């Protein structure tokens, strides 16, 4: 099964028996995709154990996988398990179950439901300022992901359930942060991916990848708790009480971890680029004079704010890779792909490809200016994926993150702390994060 890419004439690194190419992940997914993107060209194929992975970089071929032939061939992501009752999650469900859940949870972020959440979010934007002010009046370096993670848990627990709890040692933030830790040197996540034929053993043995009593804390909390929660109970009165909790675990983890990590990535670039931070602070004071409260319309008007978010998502795509499982033999864009091959889009490697980005290692929000936005291919820069299975909370996350960036730069400027990791070392482990936590000095205006 390791002579597949040799048969199809597709270049790639020579795989070792059983292991394949997983020993090249010692530098992480990001550095492995960039090295393979320069050695083999536009299209290459490696092996994750016995699973052949075809990496495509052609924007037209990316469009065929993600958009044109999504409902037909490339419908499901890589099989992940053992998951137990989490198999009913929209990000894990396949085919018919994904179609009914994608359409059910889509009205969660209609232009009306998302506008109902602005008065809910504006409350926690002041607690974020009032908590930073206590660590700003004193000369204490602030761990950004701690204060950003608390704000992210409040928004997702109120915009999806309507409960006010968070905002210190909060039980939701504590159990959600340890919900999953893909440390590739853990023999568990190493084996079940390299040697996957033992997954149905753990399935019939009632085993799961998510901790047992971490799933219990969130399973009984949803049973304890029109929004995201109301949009599903109305359809319940074949959504069962078990598939319901699986979706809440998805929204709580995504609304907390994805938001706080990007915000820390935003604040790091603004501290290492004071000209970008000051130019962004001058724009917020113009659209919102006298520290006016930001509304739904004033956020979309800020052009440079969207250019800073889009550039950071280019430098730090938290998903790193996009994956689709080929469900039947196809010949797309002049290339045959057999059934069972995982078609992967190196999102991290494409965002820094010199063929599509001038000076890619440098932080320049001017790439997304209305003059230069033309030169951006919508299938090379895909921080939220693309097609019918993109980020469902894209318009939610893009709004929720910008709502946090506005209320912070109105009152505080951020400077390095010397103990701040400059340059920022990404975590060469599993998910995308910094090695050392981001710490910055908070000076009040």
Ligand X SMILES: CC(C)(C)OC(=O)N[C@@H](CS[C@H](Cc1ccccc1)C(=O)NCCCc1cccnc1)Cc1ccccc1
Which pair of structure tokens corresponds to residue 147? 């204060």
Listed in order, strand segments (DSSP E) in 295-402 are: 321-325, 330-331, 336-337, 342-346
Interface with its own copies by CB under 8 A: which range of 80-88, 245-253, 264-272, 374-382?
374-382
Question: Is 391 annotated in some ligand binding site?
Answer: yes
Q: How far is the CB of 61 from its own copies (least distance, A)?
A: 14
> Of 285-304, which residues contact ligand HEM (CB under 6 A)?
none
Scan for tokens 């113009």, then name that residue.
286
Question: Is 356 near ligand X (CB under 6 A)?
Answer: no
Which one of its own copies, ligand HEM, ligand X, none is in contact with 378 (Cβ closer than 5 to 8 A by kind)? its own copies
Interface with its own copies by CB under 8 A: which range of 119-127, 248-256, 371-379, 410-418?
371-379
Residue 358 CB coordination number (10 Å): 11
Exactly one of 112, 168, 187, 423 binds its own copies (CB under 8 A); that residue is 112
* Residue 199 CA: distances (Å) to CA of 150, 196, 313: 35, 6, 34
Question: Is 80 near ligand X (CB under 6 A)?
Answer: yes
Exactly one of 185, 198, 286, 292 binds its own copies (CB under 8 A); that residue is 286
Exactly one of 205, 374, 418, 423 binds its own copies (CB under 8 A); that residue is 374
Of 10 and 397, nearer to ligand HEM (C-beta) is 397
Exactly one of 234, 377, 435, 443 binds its own copies (CB under 8 A); that residue is 377
- Give the residue at shortest CB distance from ligand X: 91
Q: How far is the CB of 315 from ligand HEM (least distance, A)?
A: 12
Which one of its own copies, ligand X, ligand HEM, none is in contact with 80 (Cβ closer than 5 to 8 A by kind)? ligand X
> Of 380-419, which residues contact ligand X (CB under 6 A)?
391
Handedness of CA 118, 121, 127, 131 (dihedral sign): negative
Residues 22/15, Cβ–Cβ less than 8 Å: no
Residues 438/266, Cβ–Cβ less than 8 Å: no
Which one of its own copies, ligand HEM, ligand X, none is in contact with 253 (Cβ closer than 5 to 8 A by kind)? ligand X
Scan for tokens 């059910």, then name that residue.
104
Query: Cα–Cα distance between 84 and 79 in angstroms, integer?
Result: 13
DSSP 334: S
Query: Cα–Cα distance between 86 and 73 in angstroms, integer?
Result: 24
Question: Is 149 near ligand HEM (CB under 6 A)?
Answer: no
Of 366, 364, 363, give the one whose Cα is nearest residue 422: 363
73: helix, strand or coil: coil
Exactly one of 376, 424, 428, 431 binds its own copies (CB under 8 A); that residue is 376
Question: Is 384 near ligand HEM (CB under 6 A)?
Answer: yes
Question: Is 273 near its own copies (CB under 8 A)?
Answer: no
DSSP 416: -
Chain CA centroid to CA 31, Å: 18
56: helix, strand or coil: strand
Question: Is 83 near ligand HEM (CB under 6 A)?
Answer: no
Listed in order, strand segments (DSSP E) in 50-170 are: 51-56, 142-143
Residue 157 CB coordination number (10 Å): 23
Interface with ligand HEM by CB under 6 A: which range of 7-15, 90-98, 114-122, 124-132?
90-98
Which one of ligand X, ligand HEM, its own copies, none is in contact with 179 (Cβ closer than 5 to 8 A by kind)? ligand X
Query: Cα–Cα distance between 59 and 380 in angstroms, integer?
Result: 6
Question: Is 427 near ligand X (CB under 6 A)?
Answer: no
Interface with ligand X by CB under 6 A: which range of 87-95, 153-161, 199-207, 297-305?
87-95
Query: Cα–Cα distance between 52 and 13 in angstroms, integer?
Result: 12
Listed in order, strand segments (DSSP E) in 120-259 are: 142-143
Give the residues lining the site for ligand HEM (CB under 6 A).
Answer: 66, 90-91, 98, 102, 250-251, 254-255, 258-259, 262, 313, 318-319, 322, 383-387, 389-393, 396-397
């Amino acid at each position: 099964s390791h002579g597949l890419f040799k048969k199809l004439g597709i270049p790639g690194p020579t795989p070792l028996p059983f292991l394949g190419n997983i020993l090249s992940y010692h530098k992480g997914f990001c550095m492995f995709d960039m090295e393979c993107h320069k050695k083999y060209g536009k299209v290459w194929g490696f092996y994750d154990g016995q699973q052949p992975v075809l990496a495509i970089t052609d924007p037209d071929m990316i469009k065929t996988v993600l958009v044109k032939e999504c409902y037909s061939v490339f419908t499901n992501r890589r099989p992940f398990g053992p998951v137990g009752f989490m198999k009913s999650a929209i990000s894990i469900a396949e085919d018919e179950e994904w179609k009914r859940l994608r359409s059910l949870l889509s009205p969660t972020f209609t232009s009306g439901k998302l506008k109902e959440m602005v008065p809910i979010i504006a409350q926690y934007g002041d607690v974020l300022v009032r908590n930073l002010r206590r660590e700003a009046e004193t000369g204490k370096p602030v761990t950004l992901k701690d204060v950003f993670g608390a704000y992210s848990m409040d928004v997702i627990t109120s915009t999806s359930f309507g409960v006010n709890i968070d905002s210190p040692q909060d039980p939701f933030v504590e159990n959600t942060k340890k919900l999953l830790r893909f440390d590739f040197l853990d023999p568990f996540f190493l084996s079940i991916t390299v040697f996957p034929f033992l997954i149905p053993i753990l399935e019939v043995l009632n085993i799961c990848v998510f901790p047992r009593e971490v799933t219990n804390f969130l399973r009984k909390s949803v049973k304890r708790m029109v929004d995201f929660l109301q949009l599903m109970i109305d359809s319940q009165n074949a959504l069962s009480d078990l598939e319901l909790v699986a979706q809440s675990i998805i929204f709580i983890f995504a609304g907390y971890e994805t938001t706080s990590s990007v915000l820390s990535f935003i604040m790091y670039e603004l501290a290492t680029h004071p000209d970008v931070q000051q130019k962004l602070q001058e724009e917020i004071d113009a659209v919102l004079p006298n520290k006016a409260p930001p509304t739904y319309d004033t956020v979309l008007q800020m052009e440079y704010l969207d250019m800073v978010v889009n550039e950071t998502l280019r430098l730090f795509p938290i998903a790193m890779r996009l994956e689709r499982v080929c469900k039947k033999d196809v010949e797309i864009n002049g290339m045959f792909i057999p059934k069972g091959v995982v078609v992967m889009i190196p999102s991290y490697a494409l965002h820094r490809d010199p063929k599509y980005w001038t000076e890619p290692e440098k932080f320049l929000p001017e790439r997304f200016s209305a003059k230069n936005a033309d030169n951006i291919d919508p299938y090379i820069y895909t921080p939220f994926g693309s097609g019918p299975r993109n980020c469902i909370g894209m318009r939610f996350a893009l709004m929720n993150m910008k709502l946090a960036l506005i209320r912070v730069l109105q009152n505080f400027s951020f400077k390095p702390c010397k103990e701040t990791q400059i340059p920022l070392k990404l975590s060469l482990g599993g998910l995308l994060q910094p090695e050392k936590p981001v710490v910055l000095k908070v000076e009040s205006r």
